[PDB]
Amino acid sequence: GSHMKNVSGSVKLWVDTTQVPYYKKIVANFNKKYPDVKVKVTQSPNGSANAKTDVGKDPAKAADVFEVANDQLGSMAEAGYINPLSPDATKAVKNNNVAVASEGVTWKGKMFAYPFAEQAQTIYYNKSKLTADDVKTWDGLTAKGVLATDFTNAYNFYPVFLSAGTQLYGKTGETVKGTDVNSAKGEQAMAWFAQQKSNKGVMQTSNALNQLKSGKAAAILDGPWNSANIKKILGKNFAVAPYPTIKLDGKDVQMQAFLGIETFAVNSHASGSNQKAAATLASFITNKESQLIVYDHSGQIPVDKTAQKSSKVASDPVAGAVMTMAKPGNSTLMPKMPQMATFWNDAAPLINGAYTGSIPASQYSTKLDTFVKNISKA
Ligand SMILES: OC[C@H]1O[C@@H]2O[C@H]3[C@H](O)[C@@H](O)[C@@H](O[C@H]4[C@H](O)[C@@H](O)[C@@H](O[C@H]5[C@H](O)[C@@H](O)[C@@H](O[C@H]6[C@H](O)[C@@H](O)[C@@H](O[C@H]7[C@H](O)[C@@H](O)[C@@H](O[C@H]8[C@H](O)[C@@H](O)[C@@H](O[C@H]1[C@H](O)[C@H]2O)O[C@@H]8CO)O[C@@H]7CO)O[C@@H]6CO)O[C@@H]5CO)O[C@@H]4CO)O[C@@H]3CO
Ligand SMILES: [Cl-]
Numbered sequence: 001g002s003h004m005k006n007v008s009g010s011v012k013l014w015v016d017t018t019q020v021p022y023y024k025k026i027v028a029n030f031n032k033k034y035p036d037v038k039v040k041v042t043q044s045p046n047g048s049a050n051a052k053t054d055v056g057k058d059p060a061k062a063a064d065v066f067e068v069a070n071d072q073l074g075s076m077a078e079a080g081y082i083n084p085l086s087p088d089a090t091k092a093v094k095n096n097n098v099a100v101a102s103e104g105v106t107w108k109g110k111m112f113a114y115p116f117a118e119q120a121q122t123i124y125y126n127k128s129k130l131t132a133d134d135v136k137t138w139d140g141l142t143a144k145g146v147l148a149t150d151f152t153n154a155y156n157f158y159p160v161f162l163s164a165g166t167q168l169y170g171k172t173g174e175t176v177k178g179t180d181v182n183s184a185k186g187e188q189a190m191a192w193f194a195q196q197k198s199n200k201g202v203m204q205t206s207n208a209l210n211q212l213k214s215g216k217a218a219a220i221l222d223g224p225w226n227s228a229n230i231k232k233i234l235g236k237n238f239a240v241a242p243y244p245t246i247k248l249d250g251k252d253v254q255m256q257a258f259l260g261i262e263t264f265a266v267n268s269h270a271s272g273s274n275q276k277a278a279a280t281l282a283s284f285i286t287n288k289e290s291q292l293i294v295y296d297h298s299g300q301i302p303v304d305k306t307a308q309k310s311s312k313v314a315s316d317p318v319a320g321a322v323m324t325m326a327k328p329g330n331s332t333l334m335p336k337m338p339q340m341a342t343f344w345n346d347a348a349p350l351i352n353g354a355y356t357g358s359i360p361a362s363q364y365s366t367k368l369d370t371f372v373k374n375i376s377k378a
């Protein structure tokens with residue numbers, strides 16, 4: 001292949017807390033190929049779950065490349081904080097990674113970030129307290145041991161509405177007026193949250209990990225970002241499983257999680273002379289080798305197709321549970337509508353109000369109607 005212009009510059013990379021050490025190793029691999037791109041790796045101010053805020057507060061001071069959860073991408077694209085990937089970069093992402101990873105980064109048919117990990121929550125449990133059979137159903141698990149969780153976190157519990165048969169922004173998460181939780185099915189989910197307050201096997205906590213460490217919890221729901229810490233806390237007792245079934249409408253139905261795609265995006269407001277270097281870095285740190293280094297350190301699940309089939313990943317307990325949860329019917333891809341910030345801000349008090357009893361059952365249909373109106377604005 002004929003000579004291409006040398007890639008050079010100086011770029012800053014934002015990653016989540018605890019991820020810097022192994023991204024520095026990935027950057028060392030990057031610099032074997034691109035020695036003239038100087039990279040500084042730091043944590044971001046508030047993490048990938050807060051990227052649109054961290055970047056938007058001052059785009060020209062934000063990192064050139066930053067970690068960002070896929071739900072934020074439509075808002076950031078519409079605001080002009082991230083540009084479409086090039087045709088060649090898009091083609092490579094789409095060929096190399098699982099289909100849902102490409103869907104996760106695509107807004108209006110164009111890709112806006114470089115996906116690298118698949119996130120779906122699972123049950124982590126102490127297998128000296130609960131067996132694999134015990135964790136198959138929510139009522140059966142919670143009758144036997146304490147599950148510690150947070151009903152103020154809508155990422156944990158909104159997917160019960162999806163188990164109930166409602167849609168979030170319509171059939172593929174792209175329909176502004178497509179959330180239909182203002183229905184009898186939505187009321188079923190509200191009642192399920194409310195049931196948990198008096199379930200002595202369910203503990204509300206802001207820090208489920210601490211309850212696992214203290215032994216107060218037999219099980220938690222969590223994502224693969226915390227898997228290394230959970231393995232160390234639980235030791236010989238570590239076990240993981242997909243979410244259980246729950247009882248809604250007289251049936252047993254799989255309890256869903258969200259399916260999130262973790263990504264890196266290029267800041268369109270970072271220094272112009274460094275934009276080529278930034279895109280080159282984003283492509284490299286999300287390549288197959290880099291995804292497998294992330295897996296080796298944190299246990300997060302690659303989106304690269306070959307990595308998912310590889311012996312190490314296919315046989316890993318956490319990866320197996322996460323990949324099962326990623327299947328249709330077990331999870332729903334987080335939508336990326338620009339309305340998502342409003343959705344998150346309004347969904348948490350809706351769910352927590354049902355759980356705590358602050359919202360009585362006589363108000364469920366009213367509160368669901370107001371919620372749909374509030375999250376469906378153009
Ligand atoms: O200690 C935790 C955290 O606390 C502080 O964050 C708060 C923040 O300041 C508030 O503004 C608010 O955040 C809201 C947020 O701005 C909204 O965008 C929205 O968020 C939704 C996300 O957009 C959506 O993607 C999803 O988020 C889930 C992620 O997709 C998923 O990956 C996972 O996230 C975990 C990370 O993967 C993991 O690396 C690890 O991250 C650590 C951070 O890197 C580190 O900065 C710190 O985070 C602080 C933060 O700095 C404070 O400002 O510690 C993290 C580990 O403790 O862990 C992540 C999980 O914590 O899971 C998230 C879901 O939890 O859904 C969210 C909606 O739930 O709404 C937000 C809430 O209104 O609140 C946060 C939290 O109090
Ligand atoms: Cl159940």
Ligand SMILES: [Cl-]
Binds near residue numbers: 138139245246247
């Ligand atoms: Cl149940």
Ligand SMILES: [Cl-]
Binds near residue numbers: 370371
């Ligand atoms: Cl509301």
